[PDB]
Ligand binder design. Structure first.
Ligand SMILES: Nc1ncnc2scc(-c3ccc(NC(=O)Nc4cc(C(F)(F)F)ccc4F)cc3)c12
Length: 292
């Protein structure tokens, strides 16, 4: 509602730092315990001894994320500005990132162990949740710019939420390329206009969703894995498309092809993508036991 426009402020004594999860763009990331919020586990981002403009950006980021509230968007609880460091509060997703989850439930993982192989029904349930979250972001005129399974988070009962880590993860360093020798960009999830002209829109996010769908149906495999970064851009710019995954239905692959149109405004709309995925997920629901 309208109250979400105003940033929720949390008292310092209510945050109990437990584990240093890593380091990001503006500071450290921690696993913490938050009391009198509604105790719950939280993923917190810190900003230590920063300038007036950097603290201004922190409050600006807080003002953006406070209004960005949805069932399939990682919950932003608020900020703690009482002293240094400045704390940004998000929910802690126990099961971690979606890419790690997809790989843990892949045919190789089942064979190397025992976890259950991720079914087509479970794949459709994951797909419709990300599509629902993307529908919300488009309605709020927000361009994600980095939509990938590594940026999605898994909760309880196959619950999937979209996030943007902004944290240095060495395991995903190969998923970024220094475009023009200036910006680290996720080329394998990017359309031609984003790689060549750095144009990021709702339509460029649609292309990324098509690639996210490819990731889900391939058990978290890297798109264009057979190719080098140069060959990836060549295929994207020339009009070559990713292969149809074995576990992917023809309706879903044709939807992926609709996301992969060269012209940004010729791509399938997010509402239409979600409606189809929601209908197929309801036709093939999740009922089987999932083991890790
Ligand atoms: N949430 C977690 N649960 C378990 N382990 C970890 S280990 C780290 C995190 C972590 C910390 C902060 C964030 N922040 C985030 O997603 N912010 C954010 C979201 C959006 C979105 F609305 F599009 F999703 C856009 C811009 C953003 F900065 C994500 C993951 C995390």
């Amino acid at each position: 509602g309208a109250m979400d426009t105003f940033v929720q402020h949390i008292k310092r004594h209510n945050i109990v730092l437990k584990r240093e999860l890593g380091e990001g763009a503006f500071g450290k990331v921690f696993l913490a315990e938050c009391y009198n919020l509604c105790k719950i586990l939280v993923a917190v981002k810190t900003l230590k001894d920063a300038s007036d403009n950097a603290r201004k950006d922190f409050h600006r980021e807080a003002e953006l994320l406070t209004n960005l509230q949805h069932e399939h968007i990682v919950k932003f609880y608020g900020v703690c500005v009482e002293g240094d460091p400045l704390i940004m509060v998000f929910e802690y997703m126990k099961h971690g990132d979606l890419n790690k989850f997809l790989r843990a439930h892949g045919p190789d993982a089942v064979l190397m162990a025992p976890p259950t192989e991720l079914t087509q029904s479970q794949m459709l349930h994951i797909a419709q949740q990300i599509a629902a979250g993307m529908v919300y972001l488009a309605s709020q005129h927000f361009v994600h710019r980095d939509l990938a399974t590594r940026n999605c988070l898994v909760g309880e009962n196959l619950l999937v939420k979209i996030g943007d880590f902004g944290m240095s993860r060495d395991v995903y360093s190969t998923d970024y390329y220094r475009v023009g020798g200036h910006t680290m960009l996720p080329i394998r999830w990017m359309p031609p206009e984003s790689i060549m002209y750095r144009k990021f829109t709702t339509e460029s996010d649609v292309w990324s969703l098509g690639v996210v769908l490819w990731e889900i149906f391939t058990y978290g495999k890297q798109p264009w894995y057979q190719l080098s970064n140069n060959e990836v851009i060549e295929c994207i710019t020339q009009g070559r498309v990713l292969q149809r995954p074995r576990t992917c239905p023809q309706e879903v692959y044709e939807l992926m092809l609709g996301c992969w149109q060269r012209e940004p405004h010729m791509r399938k709309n997010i509402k239409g993508i979600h409606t189809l995925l929601q209908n197929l997920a309801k036709a093939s629901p999740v009922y089987l036991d999932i083991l890790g």
